[PDB]
């Protein structure tokens, strides 16, 4: 089997992407944030504290003939950005782009933090990291991909995120029309439960490539590119007037700037992030200070190849017995 679904930016900045997901019988379609940095499929629901729902579409398990309470199971998750959610668990039929999993754990939120409430466009998350990170207790649950894997034509999914445009998540096949040149594959460590890999270096604009190992995670659920302070300083030093602002929470730059590109290495290959991808616009409405899309990972504890990086590539998440990651230009 295979699946193919379009993923759409939630706003004009590509802050996140939503993908429609069918849950239950008859189908209830929710728009979920596919997150290769976590491993829980959770949704706003009929059980979510009413004051914490503001415009989201909810899953109502009592209206699904295939929903079953997973008795005694609870979940609770905290994300890198400080947001969180928790609740109980149902199993139900879940389909993505024509690919169906029966008996998928659907984690029903009883509580969500303010950031989730305030984002009316995201109805929940669909985790695509390794199932070892799943938070369901006392019986850990599998991700949608893990459940689908054996049925897929090939044990892979791909992320093809757009810049200010829709893109695609495919399951079970590699669309050879969706990228240019060849795909370069690189080793993955699953020791922390992430799609963790090592970039071979970077360049700023038309500058020379610096060969240096940068361990980090491929994370579709993180907006920006978070890299070591040395690398980030080298980038922003090429933008007149750019500076790190503790009050704003990172590097800002004059909105009048033209940003240089940023290149990262994948083995001997190179992925180029155009300068425009690194512009996250005014820090507040009407400001002439703009927020940067490359930020320091210092104090996160891990480097994160988030959407800013991933959307410059066609990315293969290879879930074979020994997982790997592939990157192609597009």
From Swiss-Prot:
One of its GO terms (molecular function) is aspartic-type endopeptidase activity. Transmembrane segments: none annotated. Disulfide bonds join 255-290. The active site is at residues 35, 199. It comes from the Eukaryota. The keyword Disulfide bond applies. Its EC number is 3.4.23.22. The keyword Hydrolase applies. One of its GO terms (biological process) is proteolysis. It is an enzyme of class 3 (hydrolase). Keywords: Aspartyl protease, Disulfide bond, Hydrolase, Protease, Signal, Zymogen. It catalyses: Hydrolysis of proteins with specificity similar to that of pepsin A, prefers hydrophobic residues at P1 and P1', but does not cleave 14-Ala-|-Leu-15 in the B chain of insulin or Z-Glu-Tyr. Clots milk. Residues 17-328 form the Peptidase A1 domain. Belongs to the peptidase A1 family. This is Endothiapepsin. It comes from Cryphonectria parasitica. The chain holds residues 90 to 419 of 419 of the full protein.
């Amino acid at each position: 089997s295979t699946g193919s679904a379009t993923t759409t930016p939630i706003d004009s900045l590509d802050d996140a992407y939503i993908t429609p997901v069918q849950i239950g019988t008859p189908a209830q379609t929710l728009n979920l944030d596919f997150d290769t940095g976590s491993s829980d499929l959770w949704v706003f629901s009929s059980e979510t504290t009413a004051s914490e729902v503001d415009g989201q579409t909810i899953y109502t398990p009592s209206k699904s003939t295939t929903a079953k309470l997973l008795s005694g199971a609870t979940w609770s998750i905290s994300y890198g950005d400080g947001s969180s959610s928790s609740g109980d668990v149902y199993t139900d039929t879940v389909s993505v782009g024509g690919l169906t999993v029966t008996g998928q754990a659907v984690e029903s939120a009883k509580k969500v933090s303010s950031s989730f409430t305030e984002d009316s466009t995201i109805d929940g998350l669909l985790g695509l990291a390794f199932s070892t990170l799943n938070t369901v207790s006392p019986t850990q649950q599998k991700t949608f991909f893990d459940n689908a894997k054996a049925s897929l034509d090939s044990p892979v999914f791909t992320a093809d995120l757009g810049y200010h445009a829709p893109g695609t998540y495919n399951f079970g096949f590699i669309d050879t029309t969706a990228y240019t040149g060849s795909i370069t594959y690189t080793a993955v460590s699953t020791k922390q439960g992430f799609w963790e890999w090592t970039s071979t270096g970077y360049a700023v604009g038309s500058g020379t490539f610096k060969s240096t190992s940068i361990d980090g995670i491929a994370d579709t659920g993180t907006t920006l590119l978070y890299l070591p302070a040395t690398v980030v300083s080298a980038y922003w030093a090429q933008v007149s007037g750019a500076k790190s602002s503790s009050s704003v929470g990172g590097y800002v730059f004059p909105c009048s700037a033209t940003l240089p590109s940023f290149t990262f290495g994948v083995g001997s290959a190179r992925i180029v992030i155009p300068g425009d991808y690194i512009d996250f616009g005014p820090i507040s409405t009407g400001s002439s200070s703009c927020f940067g899309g490359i930020q320091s990972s210092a104090g996160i504890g891990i480097n994160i190849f988030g959407d800013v990086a991933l959307k410059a590539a066609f990315v293969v998440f290879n879930g074979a017995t020994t997982p790997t990651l592939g990157f192609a230009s597009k």
